């Protein structure tokens, strides 16, 4: 039994509505008891998958009523009303006729205002640099959508390929994201050039914000 | 009820690994006791079933090479080998199974698959109205690192982001934390790092 769900991604602010949607492709209803053995997980980052329905429409408890499951055979439907900021997660349909299946899921984002991102540079420090390698840290903080990009240059030339790039999870409260771009550079050529910059877009900033230090000053 | 899994495990590739899922508060031959996949990328994938009554197994068809499920009715625990390891298999494994009212799921037993061998980071400063300071965390295996900042004393404003794995199969990570300016110099700011696998513990002060 084959389970897809629907939409595998979306974006709702806080307050509206959400529907997904699961579809088995053979029904898991059973005669014997008129029971779709199909059951709704929600997995937040970070942690285990939790139990929200089972019987496609029995809450588990201490769920809240904002979450209602609904559909029969195979079209499921898992509707939150109301949406909070803590209902951000991953949320998986399951099927348990004899064996288990499980859907691909649908991520729900909280979807909020654009923020552009504040923007901080680190040189690599002086215990670092007694190693043989340089690592230059750029910090991108509180901004929505997730979506940026890190451009660092070095004595103005293009750096590609020597950086990497982290982001948080979306904040509890204001659902903004972080990123941290780390340029990697060996001790020799970061000694050779003086004029460090990460130059950062984002679809908040009405044109790119640079952030530069100059080694040694 | 309760399912009791085994520690977190580390693999060479090529090699085999076994975990364990010690059932209580309920009749262990009694329900199926099943294995789920998670892995960052690929949600979550049933891996397969055993009946502890008879001991017959049944296996996803992705599975039925990599994964083998046994249990031991005397000691209400189930195990389940993976084996030919591969960096493919590095993720978070789950036994659960079913009741009238809920589900019961274990804890998860993570597994990485790396030739990588255990390290210890090196912790180094990210040193600073708003300032940002931090602590780069770097060159370590296998995740995870935690990662405080004054003890427990400052969690406002923090960040800690995920690990990179970098080309040289370590992970490496940053943690940042903005603060007033004015602060600098009237407040300490001491970023607390535990890396477990290696008994590693590093507590930085970070100063401009
Ligand atoms: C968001 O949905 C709520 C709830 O309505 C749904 O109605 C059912 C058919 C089913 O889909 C359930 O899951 C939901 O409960 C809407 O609130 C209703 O609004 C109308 C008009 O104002 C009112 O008469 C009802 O009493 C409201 N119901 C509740 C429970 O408050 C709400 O309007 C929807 N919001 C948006 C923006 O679509």
């Known amino acids: 039994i084959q389970l897809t769900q629907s939409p595998s991604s979306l974006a709702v602010s806080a307050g509206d509505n959400v529907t997904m949607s699961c579809k088995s492709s053979?029904?898991?209803?059973?005669?014997?008891?008129?029971?779709?053995?199909l059951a709704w997980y929600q997995q937040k980052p970070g942690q285990s998958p939790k139990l929200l329905i089972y019987?496609?429409?029995t809450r588990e408890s201490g769920v809240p009523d904002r979450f209602t499951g609904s559909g029969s055979g195979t079209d499921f439907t898992l509707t939150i009303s109301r949406v909070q900021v803590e209902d951000l997660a991953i949320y998986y349909c399951?099927?348990?006729?004899?064996?288990?299946?499980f859907g691909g899921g649908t991520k729900l984002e909280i979807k909020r205002t654009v923020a552009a991102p504040s923007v901080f540079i680190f040189p690599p420090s002086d215990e670092q640099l007694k190693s043989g390698t340089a690592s230059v840290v750029c910090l991108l903080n509180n901004f929505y959508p997730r979506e940026a990009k890190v451009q660092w240059k070095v004595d103005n030339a293009l750096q590609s390929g020597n950086s990497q790039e982290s982001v948080t999870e979306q904040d509890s409260k204001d659902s903004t994201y972080s990123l941290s771009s780390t340029l990697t550079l060996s001790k020799a050529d970061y000694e050779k050039h003086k004029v460090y910059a990460c130059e950062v877009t984002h679809q908040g900033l009405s044109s790119p914000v640079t952030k530069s230090f100059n080694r040694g000053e | 009820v309760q399912l009791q899994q085994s520690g977190a495990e580390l693999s060479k590739p090529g090699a085999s690994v076994k975990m364990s899922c010690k059932a209580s508060?309920?009749?262990?031959?009694?329900?199926?006791l099943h294995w789920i996949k998670q892995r960052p990328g690929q949600g979550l994938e049933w891996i397969g079933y055993?009946?502890?009554?008879?001991?017959?197994?049944e296996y996803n068809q992705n599975f039925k090479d990599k994964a083998t499920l046994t249990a031991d009715k005397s000691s209400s625990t189930a195990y389940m080998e993976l084996s030919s390891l591969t960096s493919e298999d590095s993720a978070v494994y789950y036994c659960?199974?079913?009741?009238?009212?809920?589900?019961?799921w274990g804890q998860g037993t993570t597994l990485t698959v790396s030739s990588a061998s255990t390290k210890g980071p090196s912790v180094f400063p990210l040193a600073p109205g708003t300032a940002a300071l931090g602590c780069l965390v770097k060159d370590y295996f296998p995740e995870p690192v935690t990662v405080s900042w004054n003890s427990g004393a400052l969690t406002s404003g923090v960040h800690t982001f995920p690990a990179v794995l970098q080309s040289s199969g370590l992970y490496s990570l940053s943690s940042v934390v903005t603060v007033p300016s004015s602060s600098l110099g009237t407040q300490t700011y001491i970023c607390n790092v535990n890396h477990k696998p290696s008994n590693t513990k590093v507590d930085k002060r970070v100063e401009p």
């Open positions: 055993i009946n502890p009554r008879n001991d017959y197994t």
């Open positions: 019987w496609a429409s």
């Open positions: 399951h099927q348990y006729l004899s064996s288990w299946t």
């Open positions: 053979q029904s898991v209803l059973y005669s014997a008891n008129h029971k779709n053995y």
């Open positions: 508060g309920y009749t262990f031959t009694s329900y199926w």
């Open positions: 659960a199974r079913r009741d009238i009212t809920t589900f019961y």
